[PDB]
């Protein structure tokens, strides 16, 4: 979604470095008004010091700052914080891998379903349509971006992805839970009624197709799980606590004090915490890490791009199942058909790439 | 793709010594610039304090190097980096196991797929470059080292990987989106169109090949995730900002101060940092472990061999399928036949491993 | 069809610097790996170097190391060339081919004259 | 540096003969190499490459073979157009280097 993987193919000099400077899905960009509002409580705490408090006043403040900053402590924070954040990172990429792609049933829809008239080419058309159907309806669920563009039944009806027909089907059937599993019993069905009107060979090859609509209706399911079992909300808030204790400390407690009086540990004033900042932009930005994939289909700049997949698998499935189907390119004999040891060429900039065959650890190399 | 499994077979005296003075892929090779800019950075500071700062200023940049000395801290950020380098190397390991191999199809296509004549011979040859196609095509979207070797679809073509008519059914399909996947939809049509040709048997055998078709279009697929959900850039900032802080505060905080100001932990000048600089190694090294492995399909040393891949994968492929068709070796009677409790000879370097029948903790050892 | 056209002719004084260009058409420019070959009467070719035209990635030939200087306009799908401290000896004909595991097609050249 | 040695220097012949020009590779080089086709004051123009498959517009009357050190270039039954230079060049890595030529002359 904010793809940077051709940046970091090779570890250079600036490999990491380079990415400080990109704002799009940035650290800045996400703590930005939390930052500002840090700043300023920081500098206003330092002003009435410096300014507004008394010389006995300031003694107190003196006195406060030291206890407030005894108990910044990171080490629990970062705890908490590690483990947090490899749960979400975790569901994270599970929720990703959870995205159902029409790939595997298009190969097989449009080879196992016969009929190159009209039809046949209804048949395979209607067919993924009801899988990406399935899909359309659990994203629309648990996607605001897909929400926002299907906000009504009528909305995926009119954008081609549900006909008229079927969605008079859909109302027909009554039950008060999530339909999106309807396409998925369709499907079925329409499978079979194809394999009984001899369209569909064997059952051998129908009870394949079978299953890797099972295996999309799966998919569907664990999106449904995670959008429905949130991590448990006490844990959020045991985090945020955890993070805000910290910075409520550091307010107070990384005050520049008075060089005069000599506390140990405050012999220098720079008027602006530097590694304090440093330290925020750390945690605030490690606890948006969290915040910014605990649900990664938002629309946050690093959340899934759910829309583009959408339109992707519309248009490769229908296109896969209809002129692709028992449409091939005319078969040749390959460049290596008397060559059995082939030896393809290398660019000029990636002939050190062609290597001897690895054959064991335990070989001797000679 | 730098392996040393060899040297570490044992655990010995120097197991893991002795790859400190390898250079390959090492962490010299990883870190030169970087240390020698910290290097330059610390001792140009160093010749400032010692050599121009007046008395006075000298005393600020003491006070100045306790207060960034006293935020060079570990802790923090070893929890981080071994968050996000333990993800970057669990990503590592998957991305390699998705690269596809075609064994598994390539057994299946070279028994059933049937006929010892030319057209049973470019049946099965076109069968395994489908598949092998729809790699290269996959390879070339996601490797650097290998898209530099097939910058262009020509060279593709060129290669022997695709044949020109393949390349204009490839292009007489209208597509907006990366076609990795059109291979593997010729591949099940023509294994469906070689079944109704009779060349394959059953539909049971059909299908078998058709579902391992399908899970390397789950390999490819799994590498296309890789490629495009790269690890969230403000996490990716987070861990260079924490390592970078703490380095900022070692230029300054680990100055050597005035010994005769006996300062309490600069009590010895030693003008070099040696233990900082070994700091220097141990955390920008486990970064560069990151820095390395977040795209393990570029030009790094330690980076995977895709190229070498590619070229073993179409060499085995289309010998298993053609040569090895319904070839096998003379049946014979094993050395064994007449043995039903064989004992297969030892080297007189191994005997020490032949061991008594592991029967279970439970049994008594006599 | 890919057609390089290159730049004319030209006439420096010893010491100065030349720019020469190529501009490739009838192709993708990025997906093809731009080279530049010298040709001197009685010698033979010789590899001045190549340039990705995507990531503009120079790799020059080490005889070459301080005299060729490589880059490209992906805007205006052109191809450059400069020659720094020219001397008599810089005199030649240049030529900017396209790599497909093999240079298959070549500019008409770009005749460089230095004398004073 | 990988050194290509290309011989004869200039070969001499009329139309109808046969010429075989040879390049041999200072190191293996598979079967990484090309032959180009250059007539005075023309660009080169692409023969053969990868060592043996021939390009788009050349003639069967051109054929080359070879692999690893030593390959050659064969033109039966000469025309009067084949008549100018002819090199070769290697395509194992950086840097390609050319071969010395050969002018092909026509013998009266």
């Known amino acids: 979604t904010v793809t940077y993987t051709n940046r970091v193919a090779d570890a250079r000099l600036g490999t990491f470095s380079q990415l400080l400077l990109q704002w799009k899905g940035s650290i800045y960009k996400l703590l930005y008004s939390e930052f500002l509002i840090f700043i300023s409580l920081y500098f206003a705490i330092s002003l009435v010091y410096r300014l507004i408090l008394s010389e006995s006043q300031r003694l107190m403040f003196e006195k406060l700052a030291l206890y407030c900053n005894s108990y910044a402590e990171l080490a629990p924070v970062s705890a908490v914080l590690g483990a947090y954040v490899s749960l979400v990172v975790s569901r994270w990429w599970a929720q990703y891998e959870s995205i159902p792609w029409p790939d595997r049933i298009m190969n097989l829809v449009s080879c196992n379903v016969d009929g190159e008239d009209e039809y046949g080419r209804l048949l395979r058309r209607t067919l993924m349509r009801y899988s990406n159907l399935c899909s359309v309806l659990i994203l629309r669920s648990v996607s605001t971006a897909v929400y926002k563009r299907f906000p009504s039944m009528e909305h995926v009806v009119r954008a081609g992805l549900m006909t008229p027909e079927e969605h008079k089907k859909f109302e027909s059937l009554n039950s008060p839970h999530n339909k999106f599993w309807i396409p998925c019993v369709w499907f079925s069905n329409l499978a079979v009624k194809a394999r009984n009107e001899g369209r569909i060979r064997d059952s051998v090859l129908l009870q394949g197709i079978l299953n890797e609509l099972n295996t999309l209706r799966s998919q569907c399911g664990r999106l449904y799980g995670y959008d429905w079992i949130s991590i448990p909300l006490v844990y959020t808030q045991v985090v945020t606590v955890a993070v805000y204790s910290f910075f409520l400390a550091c307010l107070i407690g990384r005050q520049f004090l008075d060089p005069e009086k000599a506390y140990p540990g405050h012999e220098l004033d720079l008027f602006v915490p530097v590694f304090t900042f440093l330290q925020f932009f750390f945690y605030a930005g490690w606890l948006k890490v969290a915040e910014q994939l605990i649900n990664p289909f938002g629309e946050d700049d690093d959340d899934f791009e759910t829309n583009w997949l959408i339109d992707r698998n519309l248009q490769v499935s229908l296109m896969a199942v209809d002129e692709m189907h028992q449409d091939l390119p005319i078969l040749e004999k390959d460049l290596y058909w008397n060559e059995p040891d082939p030896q393809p060429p290398y660019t000029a900039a990636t002939a050190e790439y062609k290597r001897p065959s690895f054959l064991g650890s335990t070989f001797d190399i000679s | 793709t730098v392996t040393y499994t060899n040297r570490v077979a044992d655990a010995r005296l120097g197991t893991f010594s002795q790859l400190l003075l390898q250079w390959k892929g090492s962490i010299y090779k990883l870190l030169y610039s970087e240390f020698l800019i910290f290097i330059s950075l610390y001792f140009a500071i160093s010749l400032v304090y010692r050599l121009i700062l007046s008395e006075s200023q000298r005393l600020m940049f003491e006070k100045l190097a306790l207060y960034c000395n006293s935020y060079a801290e570990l802790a923090p950020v070893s929890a981080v980096l071994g968050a996000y380098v333990s993800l970057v190397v669990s990503r590592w390991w998957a991305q390699y196991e998705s690269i596809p191999w075609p064994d598994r199809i390539m057994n299946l296509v070279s028994c059933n797929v049937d006929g010892e004549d030319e057209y049973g011979r470019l049946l099965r040859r076109t069968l395994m470059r489908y598949s092998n196609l729809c790699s290269v095509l996959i390879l070339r979207s996601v490797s650097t080292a290998v898209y530099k070797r097939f910058p262009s679809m020509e060279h593709v073509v060129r290669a022997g990987l695709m044949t020109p008519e393949e390349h204009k059914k490839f292009e007489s399909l209208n597509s907006p989106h990366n076609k990795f996947w059109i291979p593997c939809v010729w591949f099940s049509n023509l294994a469906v169109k070689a079944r109704n040709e009779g060349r394959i048997r059953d539909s049971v055998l059909l299908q078998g090949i058709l579902n391992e078709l399908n899970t390397l279009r789950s390999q490819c697929g799994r590498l296309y995730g890789y490629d495009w959900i790269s690890i969230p850039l403000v996490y990716t900032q987070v861990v260079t900002v924490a390592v970078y802080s703490f380095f900022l505060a070692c230029l300054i905080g680990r100055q050597f101060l005035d010994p005769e100001k006996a300062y309490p932990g600069h009590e010895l000048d030693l003008f070099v940092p040696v233990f900082t600089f070994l700091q220097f190694f141990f955390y920008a090294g486990w970064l560069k472990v990151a820095e390395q492995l977040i795209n393990p399909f570029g030009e790094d040393d330690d980076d995977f061999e895709t190229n070498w891949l590619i070229d073993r994968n179409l060499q085995v492929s289309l010998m298993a399928v053609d040569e090895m068709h319904q070839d096998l070796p003379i049946l014979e009677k094993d050395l064994y036949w007449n043995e039903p409790d064989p004992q297969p000879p030892y080297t007189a370097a191994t005997a020490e491993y032949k061991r008594p029948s592991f029967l279970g903790s439970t049994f008594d050892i006599s | 069809q890919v057609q390089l056209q290159q730049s004319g002719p030209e006439l420096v004084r010893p010491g100065a610097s030349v720019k020469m260009s190529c501009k490739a058409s009838?192709?993708?420019?990025?997906?093809?790996?731009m080279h530049w070959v010298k040709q001197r009467p009685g010698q033979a070719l010789e590899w001045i170097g190549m340039i990705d035209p995507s990531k503009s990635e120079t790799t020059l030939n080490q005889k070459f190391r301080g005299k060729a200087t490589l880059n490209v306009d992906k805007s205006s799908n052109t191809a450059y060339m400069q020659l720094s401290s020219l001397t008599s000896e810089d005199s030649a004909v240049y030529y900017c081919?396209?790599?497909?595991?093999?240079?298959?097609?070549w500019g008409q050249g770009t005749t460089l004259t230095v004398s004073s | 540096d990988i050194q290509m040695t290309q011989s004869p220097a200039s070969l001499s012949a009329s139309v109808g003969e046969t010429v075989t020009i040879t390049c041999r590779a200072s190191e293996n080089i598979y079967s990484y190499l090309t032959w180009y086709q250059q007539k005075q004051g023309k660009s080169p123009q692409l023969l053969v490459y990868?060592?043996?498959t021939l390009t788009e517009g050349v003639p069967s009357r051109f054929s080359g073979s070879g692999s690893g050190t030593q390959f050659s270039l064969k033109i039966n039954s000469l025309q009067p157009e084949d008549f100018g230079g002819y090199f070769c060049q290697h395509h194992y890595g950086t840097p390609p280097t050319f071969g010395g030529g050969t002018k092909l002359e026509v013998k009266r």
């Open positions: 990868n060592a043996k």
């Open positions: 081919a396209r790599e497909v595991y093999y240079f298959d097609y």
């Open positions: 009838g192709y993708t420019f990025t997906n093809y790996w």
